[PDB]
Each structure stands twice: as structure tokens, then as C-alpha cells.
């Protein structure tokens, strides 16, 4: 994953991605990458944190405690955020529990807010957990969409898959010089050789 | 939807009452979605029985009544003269959430 | 467990009106709010119900028009505006809310207020 494009040459605001230093990110590599995708109001972007408060990380997607991964949030006033209350991008609220880390909620049902349970017909209480985002490109500054991408690493006993140190320096010849080709290190002069290796 | 018109009008007796009040309904309303408020002169109302299946958290005792869908009855059994004020039936579930006519009491 | 309402507002026959119900002592984030009508020697007419956790409301047969609610999530309040005020609207509006704390809560509308006193006179 070419991490250079997102920090070295990027125009993405609020690149605070606690857990790993953005510098030399390409030189450190974890096991697997879990790409996320979110659309949040302008003010509610701060809710991405180790628990904190609010309607995010309590009923919405939750950030685990002591989590290691990077988070990015960039303004999306255009590119599928247009006039009228958008049909998509609706809340996830009114859950009996406070959710657990890393679990995904793809289930919808009428909430319970009283003694007797309504048998499927809405009325008193029994609130529908979902409400749509009523934003548009003519909103303020703290309410415009800010698409959030969360890159989740993993710390476990598994070998790292996404890697790649990159780095590059030129080659010299006929001069005593230090070399670190693939881990091996030594000192000496490098000359052209006629020996043939197997592929 | 509003044909409730609670049958009792004005009743006037000293404590020693076995009186009962009825909250008639147009259609049988599912229980536990009911209410029975108690308005007071110059003050805010209270709540006595929340759905004809239990009693509220803490309130004066010696009266608790329940009924059917079309006839949501209630009863009072020898209550003190302090609880002599206007009652109000109520319904939930179907919008609009309409109240009742109200019942009057007297000594 | 307390709920304070604004003072008696005096207005003109048909400009506007707004009432504030401050909710305290219970979790206002996930609850419901209702508004009613009162008068002197008169019955009670239900007006409109508000889920303050998520804005969804309906209104009585007399109150679909000239009536709309206002959320005002902050300050734990609830606003509700009436337009084209009529003479027969000298009413105490009141407000009610269930005692909710945690997500599942009591059914009956147990927490009330005291209401205002609006006089649409000259």
C-alpha cells in the first residue's frame, strides 16, 4: 500500500492518525489492512476517538480501546453530497446496549422503550432507530459532510502481509563501500563478474 | 375515534364509596397502551395506572381498576376526600393520541 | 425531576407564538415530548407528540397547519411555534415527557410541567 500518496503529497485535512507516526510509515508494516468508509457531519468528526462520548462509538461504529491504526477525515462538500436531504447516510441510534469493538450492525428492528413490546406496528414509543442526514451544499461550516477513512492495522501472532520498505540509493563500483542489499552487510569493492547464477 | 364519553357524570358521597368509572372506546384498544390521568384544580395532572395491568411507581393505594378493550373499566374503593378532582382517560398507539371526556366527583 | 416553563406571554391576534419547556432531572437525549391544550373550565385537547431523540411528529386534526415543532437539542429545551393566532387560543400549553435513563424506560407520561398563559388580546 503506497502510503506516500496520503501524507507526503496529499490535500487531506485533519491527518491525525494516532497509533503510528506518519513519518516512516512505509518502513513499518503490520499484518492486514481493514479499510473503512464513513460520512459524518462537520462537527461530529471528532467523535472518532478511544471511546469518548456522543452517538459515535456508542451506537455507531466503535473505536476499540488501545487501538492501533490511522484515521483520515476530508471535506466532501461535493462528490455525492448535494441538495436535498440525501436518502442515504442515516443515523444508527436507539440501541439497548453500548456496542462492542469491531462488530458490525447490519440489522434493523423496532426499538424497545416501554414495558410491553409492540408486535410490529409503530405507535407510542417503539421509535425507528434510523433518521436521515438533512444536509446540502448550502450548509454551514461545522455541518458539511466530511468523509472519514479508517485504516485499521492488526497486532497479533500472524506474519505481516502488507509491507514494502521502498528506499533507493545508487550503485558504485571499484570503491570500498558499505552495502545492505537484502540484510547482509559487508565492506569491499564491487566489480563485474562473469559467473552465472541460477534464476 | 372519539366516542369515549365516560359513563359516570357527577357522584357525591362521603368516603365509604364502592364507585366505579368506565372509559368506553370506539374500538378495542390493545392494553398496556392506556393511561388514566388525574387532573387537579389549578395544578398539573398525575398518573395512576399505566395500561390497566399494573400501578404507577408511588401513589395513594386502595383503588386499582382494569377492563377490556371497548370497556376499560376502573374502580375506586374507599379513598380519602383529598382525591376528589377531575379524572381523564387516555389512549396511545394510533395517532392522534386522544384523551377522554373526563369524570367529575363531588361530596 | 423538575421542569420549568417560561412566563406568561402576551401577544397580538395572529403574529406568532413560541413556548419553552426546559427538561431536567432525566436523560433528555433519548426521550419523548408531548404538547397539549388547556383552558378554564374546559377539556384537554392533545396537540402534538415529539420524539426528541429523533425528530418525528404528527399533529391533531386542527393542528396540521399553522403548527410545526422546533428541536433545539441543546440546553435541554423544546420549542414549538404557532402561526395565525386566533382569538380562541387563550390556552395553557403544558408539556410532558417520560422518565427515561438508559434506553428502556417507563411508559406513562409521568413528568409534566406547569404551562404558560397566552392572551391574544388588543
Numbering used by the authors:
A (entry chain A): 363 to 561
B (entry chain L): 1 to 27, 27A, 28 to 106
C (entry chain H): 2 to 52, 52A, 53 to 82, 82A, 82B, 82C, 83 to 100, 100A, ...
Quote what the paper states about this structure.
The virus is decorated with a trimeric spike protein (S), which comprises an S1 subunit that binds host cells and an S2 subunit that is responsible for membrane fusion. In this study, antibodies isolated from convalescent subjects who were infected by the Washington-1 (WA-1) strain, which has an identical S sequence to Hu-1, were investigated for reactivity against WA-1 and variants of concern (VOCs), and we defined the structural features of their binding to S. The two most potent antibodies, A23-58.1 and B1-182.1, shared highly similar gene family usage in their heavy and light chains, despite being from different donors.
Similarly, A23-58.1 and B1-182.1 bound to overlapping regions when RBDs are in the up position, suggesting that they are class I antibodies. Analysis indicated that B1-182.1 rotated about 6° along the long axis of Fab from that of A23-58.1. When compared with epitopes of class I, II, and III antibodies, the supersite defined by common contacts of the IGHV1-58–derived antibodies (A23-58.1, B1-182.1, S2E12, and COVOX253) had minimal interactions with residues at the mutational hotspots. These structural data suggest that the binding modes of A23-58.1 and B1-182.1 enabled their high effectiveness against the new SARS-CoV-2 VOCs.
